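ugh ok so i messed up the first submission bc i forgot one of the chains. this is the corrected input, ALL of the components this time, i swear. 687 residues overall. if the numbers dont match what u have on ur side tell me asap before i send this to the collaborators (the ones from the other lab, u know who)
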Amino acid sequence: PTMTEFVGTAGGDTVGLVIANVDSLLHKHLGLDNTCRSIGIISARVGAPAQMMAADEAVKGTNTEVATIELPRDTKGGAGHGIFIVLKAADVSDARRAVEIALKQTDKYLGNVYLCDAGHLEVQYTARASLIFEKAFGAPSGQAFGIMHAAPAGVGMIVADTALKTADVKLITYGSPTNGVLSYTNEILITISGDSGAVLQSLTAARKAGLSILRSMGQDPVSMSKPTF
Amino acid sequence: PTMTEFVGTAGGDTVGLVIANVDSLLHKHLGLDNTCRSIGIISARVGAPAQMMAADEAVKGTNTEVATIELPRDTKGGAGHGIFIVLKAADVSDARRAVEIALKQTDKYLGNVYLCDAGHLEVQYTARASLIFEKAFGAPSGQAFGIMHAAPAGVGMIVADTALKTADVKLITYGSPTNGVLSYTNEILITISGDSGAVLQSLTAARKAGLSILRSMGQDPVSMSKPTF
Amino acid sequence: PTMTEFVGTAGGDTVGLVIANVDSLLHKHLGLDNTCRSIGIISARVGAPAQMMAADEAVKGTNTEVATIELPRDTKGGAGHGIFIVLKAADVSDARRAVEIALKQTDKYLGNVYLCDAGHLEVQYTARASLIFEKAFGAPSGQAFGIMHAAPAGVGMIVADTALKTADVKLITYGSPTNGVLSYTNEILITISGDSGAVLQSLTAARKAGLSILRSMGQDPVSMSKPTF
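and heres the new structure output, hopefully the right one now
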């Protein structure tokens, strides 16, 4: 048969899973307690910001909270993450509902991932960051939010730097291969907040710059899919 | 010729090595001292619990001790570890003898690894955990012991949770991609102790559940080899 | 067009990049300040000591300093690093000049990398270690310097140990998969200093031993390129 805990399935190697009543021995390890022991999972081999985007859309639409967001070091491999998102809810169907949203939206966002032989580029955008990016990055709540990275890390710098030069945006996260923000990926990651117009202007210049460099390197970077802004 | 330090060779990319008299500059870094400076090594590209199982069998049969157990982040890659086991002995032949056992038993245990495109499943069992699992996991000594994980991590949860639900077992280790127990693998790992009957019942349900989910994901998971319980 | 920040391109997947005036929001994160905000980058998917060798040659020849040296966990993958080197300069052309040197020299050094299916061997040498290896390893400044590793880690031990046995050299760095010196690679790394004659004698025996073992494992290890000593 088909196990009730299964849900689907999206790009990268992503699954949606639901656990109705998590064994109490695991409660300590996830955010859980007895009034709240049902779990929604988004887990994937390839990517992380894309799935995070989809999951952030999900919590905005449901009665869920964020138990844990962790990043291997997969991707498959290298040069990026790795995604493991656990949402918690008092009621399984709330969790299931959220997982259903996140799965639906994943492939949409993977459209923002440009792959190629020597690495990748990824630029994500949201107009209201919520619980996901608040927990992952300390994104200013409710504000527009941007996520940047490229591999190898050098390309990531060019991206990161031109993003910040381009417009008036706050630098929320700087992540390098080994500064402890990233799971030893060959990336420079930047996280950005501000007015939508400003954030979008930065993201776009950054995407442009990234592709430019990757091409200069003899690469043919291609989404994925297709982008969202 | 064939270097005297060589020993073989087993599945994954595993070697058995022996060093007769480790240079004293390395003593500080391994557990070593002058009354005890001979080394037995099990090193592999793919897997870790399997080799650990084989090495635990080895120390039970020899006059050896555990210098170090470390896990890359290989596998090759991803989504798992990575194994590096160093056994110490006063006498090289004791170390060699242990390495010989561990190599013989490795492929047997790899039979418990089910591979496939989107990840893997692995369930291991022992009836007397000894020095290896005591050092690696703090396994209750002499007691039956179980090891679980699956990639991507989500599958690992389902496995982990149904194992604990199934029978009356102690939770010894909870490992996620980034909680510091695992080397940024895309896995959830669980470690279990209790009565053999209980442990075996958990392991089997967990294995069943894992395969179920992997299949629901359109995967065809296959050991390896063939399983041991 | 071709972005002014681009430079080339060498083996592994290495790029040379230059940023003229790094955005001040990133200054805190790199070593930077306002009298010194231009950046030279060497970033690659495969290897690290080779590029480090090339970059150390570069700082010896230019008015540059080391902002950051970080190692993913790439390579591609596994079983090694991963390289990300940032040099800082008051003047962009000094940085560019350094990047130009490092790119020219990279492939030369990759000649010291022997690849094969189950892992790799790498032995590097310099007669004056400078700023790179001082920052990365705390190499005794101005002295001859050696770098060793092999994957899987076991081979690394044999290499490391016979190097130290062979001649009168200082042990500067011991790195294992998980002791925190390496980014969870399946390697044992050793770093060595002393008189050139001594260092070269160690490096060569170590290289010999490594290849010996890899071959015993049924591997056909081949540089890369071709070696430098």
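quick check: Strands of chain B lie at 6-10, 14-19, 38-44, 65-70, 83-89, 113-116, 119-126, 144-151, 170-175, 188-194. that seems consistent at least. The first strand of chain B starts at residue 6 and ends at 10.
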